[PDB]
Symmetry: C3
Subunit: 125 residues, 3 copies
């Protein structure tokens, strides 16, 4: 059964503007350790960040809570499987919420165009 659904659209130029304002501080804030390692050596760091931000926002919506009760963007880790498909890995409070809700499967998709990154997340029992 579907336990939740979330979507996000991110203006890549906005992420770019935040980076101009505060350097790597947005990345330090929203990225897990594994994602941070990827960001550091990524070919297009702004685009990577915009995409990960989109998944994290969609995930928070999919859990039906948004960011609250000790949740945080850095607890929603994006990784890719061997074929390139995006996946979610949960940490701390996010992981505890998933276990409480009885989450068995987390479906993630990412898309981008020149100006926008979009993501949709479905969580399932």
């Amino acid at each position: 059964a579907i336990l939740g659904l979330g979507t996000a659209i991110v203006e890549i130029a906005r992420i770019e503007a935040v980076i101009a304002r505060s350097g790597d501080r947005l990345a330090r804030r929203v990225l897990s350790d594994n994602e941070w390692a990827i960001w550091k050596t990524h070919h297009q760091p702004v685009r990577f960040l915009a995409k990960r931000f989109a998944v994290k926002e969609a995930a928070a919506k999919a859990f039906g809570t948004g960011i609250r009760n000790g949740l945080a963007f850095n607890q929603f880790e994006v990784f890719n499987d061997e074929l390139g498909k995006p996946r979610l890995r949960l940490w701390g409070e996010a992981l505890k919420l998933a276990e409480k809700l009885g989450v068995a499967n987390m479906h993630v998709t990412l898309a981008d165009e020149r100006h926008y990154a979009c993501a949709t997340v479905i969580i399932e029992s």
Copy 2:
């Protein structure tokens, strides 16, 4: 089982142009009574309308009038669907037990996805 899936993208500027041309007529046509009440006191009514239009369009596609697809938000802010009239009747016929709604926006666009489920 998934009974239906719908998505929508709405250019907020397009909605603004409709409102410039015909006032609050669009809002009168597509909003339910509860949504209308929110529209009247909203700090950003056009954006509220664009987002609700997005959900309604997505809901219509998921089922395969817009004011019969009411958007409300729960205690945590999560968007939800409430059905009226012919929409409610259709849902019972199809055996819809669960309806999942999400919406998002940025400066120029609002987006929504709706999944209906047995």
Copy 3:
């Protein structure tokens, strides 16, 4: 059970620009024979192609593979049923892979505005 999820966003102007520089080449590669016939006489052919790209990219992502192992965008044929709702018809490797994955239901939606087309695909047991 959800077997996969895919989404895509297409800037219509980008498709317009590719057509301006290389004509029919983009369309011939990604469209099935049925879609090609429609493209050749469609009243809004660029918009048609952009929407087809959106669905096809979302479908390739929903299968969890992207374009690899003999899969091709021209194998994910979009058609509209007697009611008018968008549907997927699969060919070649895509058809074979769906069977092997145990796909019993495919859910397709698409949307467009003046500048952008988008689509989401869910495959299900």
